[PDB]
Scaffold this active site. Structure first.
Site, PDB file in Angstrom:
ATOM      1  N   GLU A  11       0.739  -1.323   0.100  1.00 35.76           N
ATOM      2  CA  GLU A  11      -0.320   0.357   0.053  1.00 35.76           C
ATOM      3  C   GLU A  11       0.701   1.243   0.183  1.00 35.76           C
ATOM      4  O   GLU A  11       0.322   2.533  -0.605  1.00 35.76           O
ATOM      5  CB  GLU A  11      -0.899   0.041   0.833  1.00 35.76           C
ATOM      6  CG  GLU A  11      -2.305  -1.389   0.838  1.00 35.76           C
ATOM      7  CD  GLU A  11      -3.484  -0.966   0.124  1.00 35.76           C
ATOM      8  OE1 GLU A  11      -3.630  -2.279  -0.303  1.00 35.76           O
ATOM      9  OE2 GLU A  11      -2.978   0.458  -0.678  1.00 35.76           O
ATOM     10  N   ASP A  20      -6.463   6.254  -5.060  1.00 32.74           N
ATOM     11  CA  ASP A  20      -6.145   4.892  -5.471  1.00 32.74           C
ATOM     12  C   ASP A  20      -5.747   4.163  -6.173  1.00 32.74           C
ATOM     13  O   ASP A  20      -5.452   5.209  -7.915  1.00 32.74           O
ATOM     14  CB  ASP A  20      -6.561   4.156  -3.305  1.00 32.74           C
ATOM     15  CG  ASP A  20      -8.234   3.695  -4.369  1.00 32.74           C
ATOM     16  OD1 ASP A  20      -8.972   3.380  -4.072  1.00 32.74           O
ATOM     17  OD2 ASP A  20      -8.465   4.031  -5.274  1.00 32.74           O
ATOM     18  N   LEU A  32      -8.765   4.406   2.969  1.00 28.42           N
ATOM     19  CA  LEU A  32      -9.617   4.143   1.557  1.00 28.42           C
ATOM     20  C   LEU A  32     -11.077   5.894   2.768  1.00 28.42           C
ATOM     21  O   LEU A  32     -11.247   5.876   3.392  1.00 28.42           O
ATOM     22  CB  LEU A  32     -10.793   3.521   0.952  1.00 28.42           C
ATOM     23  CG  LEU A  32     -11.811   3.853   0.559  1.00 28.42           C
ATOM     24  CD1 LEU A  32     -11.379   5.169  -1.053  1.00 28.42           C
ATOM     25  CD2 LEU A  32     -12.714   2.555   0.650  1.00 28.42           C
ATOM     26  N   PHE A 104      -8.145  -6.517   3.010  1.00 31.77           N
ATOM     27  CA  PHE A 104      -7.974  -5.130   3.577  1.00 31.77           C
ATOM     28  C   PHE A 104      -8.417  -4.635   2.032  1.00 31.77           C
ATOM     29  O   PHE A 104      -8.796  -3.124   1.824  1.00 31.77           O
ATOM     30  CB  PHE A 104      -6.266  -5.368   3.886  1.00 31.77           C
ATOM     31  CG  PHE A 104      -5.740  -3.620   3.688  1.00 31.77           C
ATOM     32  CD1 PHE A 104      -5.506  -3.021   2.780  1.00 31.77           C
ATOM     33  CD2 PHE A 104      -5.841  -2.588   5.188  1.00 31.77           C
ATOM     34  CE1 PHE A 104      -4.627  -1.196   4.081  1.00 31.77           C
ATOM     35  CE2 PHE A 104      -4.952  -2.180   5.976  1.00 31.77           C
ATOM     36  CZ  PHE A 104      -4.697  -0.836   4.936  1.00 31.77           C
ATOM     37  N   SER A 117     -12.522 -19.891  -4.959  1.00 29.45           N
ATOM     38  CA  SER A 117     -11.071 -19.903  -4.521  1.00 29.45           C
ATOM     39  C   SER A 117     -11.124 -20.443  -3.204  1.00 29.45           C
ATOM     40  O   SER A 117     -10.229 -20.997  -2.942  1.00 29.45           O
ATOM     41  CB  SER A 117     -10.492 -18.253  -5.377  1.00 29.45           C
ATOM     42  OG  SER A 117     -10.707 -18.025  -5.807  1.00 29.45           O
ATOM     43  N   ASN A 132      -6.944 -19.979  -9.819  1.00 34.99           N
ATOM     44  CA  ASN A 132      -8.646 -19.373  -9.883  1.00 34.99           C
ATOM     45  C   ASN A 132      -8.903 -18.291  -9.310  1.00 34.99           C
ATOM     46  O   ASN A 132      -8.601 -17.460  -9.870  1.00 34.99           O
ATOM     47  CB  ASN A 132      -9.660 -21.182  -8.576  1.00 34.99           C
ATOM     48  CG  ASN A 132     -11.314 -20.016  -8.882  1.00 34.99           C
ATOM     49  OD1 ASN A 132     -11.039 -19.517  -8.007  1.00 34.99           O
ATOM     50  ND2 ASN A 132     -11.531 -20.460 -10.098  1.00 34.99           N
TER      51      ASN A 132
END
Ligand code: NA
Ligand code: NA
Length: 162
Positions: A11, A20, A32, A104, A117, A132
């Site tokens: 990040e 972002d 965010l 996150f 998945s 996947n």
């Protein structure tokens, strides 16, 4: 390596409001603020989150404070989610961090929708799960980061974060 260092790598750290990878106003370590196109709305969220009039700039300590809250929220969101909790409980600590990273980035609801998945991860079919996971908007829009997270699920090691 640990989830905090892993997410700091993925990040970054920026002390002024920025957009972002999806174009949304963000600050700190991937915090965010809002999906609204209004910078004023983002500034209002920021002041509310920090507890003072920031005028769009925070300190490193403040960024780290929001980051710890956001990591805690991702962990708590996993544990409260009926689809994510059994997967998390089935994983080793390294792969648990990969799941926290996804939550996150995309949110509890987003990751919980990766039904096939998640099943492959629950089954410990690591190469299949990795194949996947890459068939996704997530991978296509952020491929280098998704590759690191996927490698972490595939191997159960921190090799992708060296
Ligand atoms: Na097992
Ligand atoms: Na991720």
């Amino acid at each position: 390596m640990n989830i905090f260092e892993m997410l700091r790598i993925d990040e970054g750290l920026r002390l002024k409001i920025y957009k972002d990878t999806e174009g949304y106003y963000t600050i700190g370590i991937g915090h965010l603020l809002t999906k609204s196109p209004s910078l004023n709305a983002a500034k209002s969220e920021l002041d509310k989150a920090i507890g003072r009039n920031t005028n769009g700039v925070i300190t490193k300590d403040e960024a780290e404070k929001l980051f710890n809250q956001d990591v805690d929220a991702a962990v708590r969101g996993i544990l409260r989610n009926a689809k994510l909790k059994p997967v998390f409980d089935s994983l080793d600590a390294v792969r648990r961090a990969a799941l926290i990273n996804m939550v996150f980035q995309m949110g509890e609801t987003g990751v919980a929708g990766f039904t096939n998945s998640l099943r492959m991860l629950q089954q410990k079919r690591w190469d299949e799960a990795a194949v996947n996971l890459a068939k996704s908007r997530w991978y296509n829009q952020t491929p280098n980061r998704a590759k690191r997270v996927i490698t972490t699920f595939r191997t159960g090691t921190w090799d992708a974060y060296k």
